[model samples]
Target: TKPLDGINVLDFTHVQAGPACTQMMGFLGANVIKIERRGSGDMTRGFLQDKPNVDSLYFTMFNCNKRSIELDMKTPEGKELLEQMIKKADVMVENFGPGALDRMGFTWEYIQELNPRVILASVKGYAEGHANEHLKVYENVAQCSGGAAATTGFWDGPPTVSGAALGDSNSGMHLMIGILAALEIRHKTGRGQKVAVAMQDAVLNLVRIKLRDQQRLERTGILAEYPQAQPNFAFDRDGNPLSFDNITSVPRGGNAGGGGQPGWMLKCKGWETDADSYVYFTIAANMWPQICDMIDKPEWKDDPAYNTFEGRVDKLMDIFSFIETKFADKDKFEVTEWAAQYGIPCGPVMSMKELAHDPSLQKVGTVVEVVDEIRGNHLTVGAPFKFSGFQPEITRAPLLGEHTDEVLKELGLDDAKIKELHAKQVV
Candidate 1:
């Protein structure tokens, strides 16, 4: 009963961007038929080894719930068979280099001739006009050029790339959205269209906020003070700031100033024994007095120099240092409990190991384990969306060409033709 239960996707994607989109469709209950080469299949099948001679975790992780069909489209017979599949498929997706599909002789006109209703989707390194003929791209490279590299890390430190493959994954997400939109439009017009998403465009979309900030900076010669902004004037010998980074850094005694609000990561009771024991605490503007009272520093609540937002901004660093001293000996659990009692915002950071064992996630079906016939028990991520009628069942990724014979039968080819193609290394 999944949303896309009967839809079939012709997956000709490789690597992260395209595969991720197809995998998401599979999770939503589409029958994704992955067409790979006759021998090794997708390159990810062997990437980042956790087991030998078996599909690597990198492949399996992004390829759940799909069937594999080996087809060497270089041969005439193989190309003919692919055309037959195209006639029946609802969607065709790829992330091949520019002109790769055209060079393969599968042009837009040819695909339309086979199935005019099929949605043809593609992901390239850049949009048509934006791409330079001499420039090629990878994930991080796109991020760097798209402005994420400039705004992601610490202000004082060198620009750093994010560990997440946003360039690839985000483009995949964009492609998925486009495909879904095309499918919806087909319902209205009774026709399909091509959907193209570029990696550079996707990256730029993700950093649009940074672009807004850049324009804002044009009006003001100096950047406004924010928590993460660089400090003005510089620190003196006593560690006092000559000028605050922002107007909010200073602390006010009574919930009036932004200072003395201890929102910091602190070690937990079991921090020494367990790496998972740590919590982050934040003291919002309104909660400053409550925090002072909780720490038994009630007298400072009415102190004029530490009672207003303006005053607190001036001595934000000194106030933060004082709070840091108070938190030095306190365990994360203790701080979290104490902060919670006062209605403060605080929580511990959970690692992947913790997330896997989290009862809440398991109850909601977020973390799922699927059984692979060859690998025995394999754990995989579950679908992020839920449907009332159709629930997606996590299926193991197919073995190389595991469905070749079965698929050929659907294409009206008999055992003789399949065997001949097999002998010719084109199946």
Candidate 2:
């Protein structure tokens, strides 16, 4: 059996953050009952749809292996149905706006009264009592609020948000971990508790490296690994030199490795035509000789000034510039292989098109081709974690309210009562 088998999840989340968490629970064999609006359902169902009247990739990719039930929670009958469902659920997940679930009559206290053993998990823009707790946060807003955007791009460019869903899906993953912890703790305590993950907090957690840099800057007034620490190397938009003398907080570093290592994203052949034709090459203290060997710079191997991180700070960019000339005639893969021969930490920047069509990824089941007869087949990401004894059998996402009657029956409602509820527009 899968890890989450026998767990019953009452999923009331929409869009990315909350749904990602429950969908992953579904993948791990939880019986997830997705509660949705009667007609419109999840907003992602209509977000950027490629075909008319069909679920978008945004919904299908994040919503697999879950049953759907339409519920009008504002109605008395709807609230009654939800109360019954909550009693049967092991976990109830929601990402409604502040006070929205309370307004819907499902406050934590009331939920505990209905099912003291059911865990109440929620996703919010900020923590419960934070200064910006009431502020609405989307993906980019969360990234910026969490300090990822502030330290991501070049020192000269505007603050930039990463393409990785550092706010949405990342927050969901964090909530998933918290839900699992709550589940484990319930075994000894015999009672469930409230678990909440704020999007800004999740983003900040992942951006902790930047926080480390911030503290380092505050203490020393300089970050040695940053491009700005290199004398006369980095400059601002106004052509002023960038160094610790003019800096306070951790500024944006373009491509320098922030973990105190010296590295750069060097260009490969055809870089003028291919935007991603580059490799990120790192010059570790131990790998200096290997790098010197790879670039045929034997003279630097015996030089004291070229052999250490402290000595290379002033000319690290110069060394990277010289090494890039070696790859000028080679493609990214070729450059990566050449560096690999020397045991260097160098890798090609894989483009999305390359990753989506990579055979090795599909072979390993990291990328999956889901067969959907209604929408034709489409590609979606599979589970990242693999167990030796079990593999997840992913199924297509459900249509809106596809299992409303089935779930109602499971909740012990008779056919007549279900019909009455349907006629009353409650489910």
Candidate 3:
């Protein structure tokens, strides 16, 4: 509980990126004061919601373990109050677009004067020196702007954006890492510094292999590793009998793992009726013969044409064809159990619905049931990694200006003046 017990965080972020960075501080025991508009607060409070009055799950998921205070920074009183907050704050996080804070009159030149010890952290769409640095980045925009979208999906199909929130939320996770590092530096430097993270930069870093592949194409002209570029499309050293089209750049490789053995999203029984019945399996070199036996091709284990891993390199499509046939009409879990005998890392392609309700995830605390008294109990994802003595306590997101009276009182605002500020819609 004392990990971040006295740390003060001025949360000025909305939507996803900034809050994710700051809210983790709350989970670790920081006093995170979320600054919001007088009436609206964070825009995410109005994001997808079920009822009219209650806070949205989208807001609750990100804004937990924080206090909400409303103030209009355009007003003199608001600016004065914020200045007072800056003097006492340990860190301030923001996600405004390019030059937004400079226009709003809180540039580093002015903010450092307000509190030289206050760490100023920001999350933006892009970093400096990019041609599209000024562009407004959304979830899908970051995905496409980064290398992830261009090298994802099937080569025959158009580029596809991932369903993962890696762009919006993961960037926040990256920003948090930078902020924590800055905090540690502040401990040594005895002064706070500006820390910034860009969404596109975070996503690009996440998909660094795409950049690696771009360079690999120049040296090899073809990616020998991918199944999509196999046989004639593969490395010419394999002596492929057939000629297939090759790509000048790294091509979209359906469900191929960026590195390691060949595998794919193969169909399983109930795929037609149940959408979550598919299985993704890695066909390792050593386990090739066992899978061949599983598909009723025991003779392939001895046949020179397909017996060795290198011999079947060109006929991989044919090998997958055989697997697709045998894997069809079989239960995915049943297939996994049988494939387990061969030491194959076959994973069930469980849908979000399946994983949300999975007992194992729930028991392990990855899928948590949040107890929010305002909206009743709900299921939400918990933190990714865990420690032996640390567990974040889940709480509901705040109502607009929910902590106004208490927080301002701590700022030495008397009850009568606090009432007047509320009447003026600034609390």
Candidate 4:
């Protein structure tokens, strides 16, 4: 009893963006019928395949819980079958280039004529405009044009693109929201509307705060001074800022969010053999003196040049350097144990392999092991969204044309007619 158990979707999408959106719908229990080409199926099926003749992980991961139908829409008979499927589908989704659907003879008007109640959703590279018309864009391109590239990296290094597919995934999320809104409106007005989202537009929307910062830069030459930025602000006798009362001395270990305080990544004793043999340690404000004593730096605890927040701020680089030397000799396990006694914030960064083997994730059902028909039993990240009475199950990716007969039958096509269409290279 998934959230979208009764909904039906005609997934005419290819590649990442459109498939990602439809995958979400499938996860929520929609009947997603993926219409792929007759021979190759989805483009991602052959993309960087790990096993020859097997679907790539990229395709399998995204197409879970959906049914696939191979159709040669270029053929007249295929087009007619697709028209019939469109007439019965609740939604139509695509990520094809501009005029691609029109070229396929499935115009907006034609879709509306087939099923006026159907939601038509699309994801494009950019909005129709001269500025983006000539640009060949992908995830990184969208991130750059949208302003994320400008603010993501270190101050001195070149702008870096995020490893994740933010542009594609975010655009898919936007399209999902639009489609859901359109569906809601259809319930009220009894008329469906087009739901369109562009990757560049979606990226820009996510990076709108950067634009706000640009505007703020006109008024102030420097970015606001947070504890992380102001490493050398002086303090008075009362531990208040000598320069200004508004700027109080930031307490040691106060700004935990910015990687402040005495923290270090330590290697575990068996780090070479075990992948998870590392931990991070951060000494709290109250525990700083204790850590100093342990590290043979007790004299600095009461020194005016290194006592209060302001004193440490003035010598942050020197202090951190000294701390790093102490940490360099200790293994991760030793650091974790010593830090815990003094209530220090600490954790080990879990690698992907470690994460996969984490029992807690499986116990909480955050990661699921499901049997895929084509790939056999495999693990997949489970849905995080939970409902009181509904539980979603991870299913295998569909085989090519697995549901063609069933879907065609649902659309009132007889077995003989479906067979005839199949013989004509249409499903």
TM-score against truth, every candidate: 0.84, 0.98, 0.92, 0.77
Q: Number of the top candidate by lDDT?
A: 2
Off by over 4 Å in 3: 231-246, 289-298, 302-309
Deviation in Å, model 4, residue 206 alpha carbon: 3.5
Enumerate residue pairs that collide in model 3: none
Query: Which residue pairs come into collision in candidate 4?
Result: 267-332
- Per-residue lDDT value at 207 in model 1: 76
- The CA lDDT at 329 in model 4 is 57
337-376 per-residue lDDT for model 4 (tens digits)? 7667766677665778977888999887678786876587
How many residue pairs clash in all the candidates, one count each?
Answer: 13, 0, 0, 1
Index of the highest-TM-score prediction: 2
Q: Once all C-alphas are superposed, what RMSD does model 3 give against the true structure? A: 3.6
How do these models rank on TM-score, best leading?
A: 2, 3, 1, 4
- Model 1 regions lying over 4 Å from their true place: 222-278, 283-338, 387-390
Q: Could you give candidate 1's per-residue lDDT for residues 1-427 as a string of tens digits? A: 6778888899999888999999989988898999998888899988886878888888887888889999888899888887888889999999888888888889998888889899999988878776363266789987877777766653334466877787888899899999999999899988889999888889889877556555554554332333433354344446555333332212111111122343445555666777867776665767779868876778768886666655565465456556645555667667777778989788776788877777877666677777788866666667777666666777888888999898889888878888898898888
How many backbone clashes can be found in candidate 4? 1
Candidate 1 similarity to native, TM-score: 0.84
Work out candidate 2's RMSD over C-alphas. 1.0
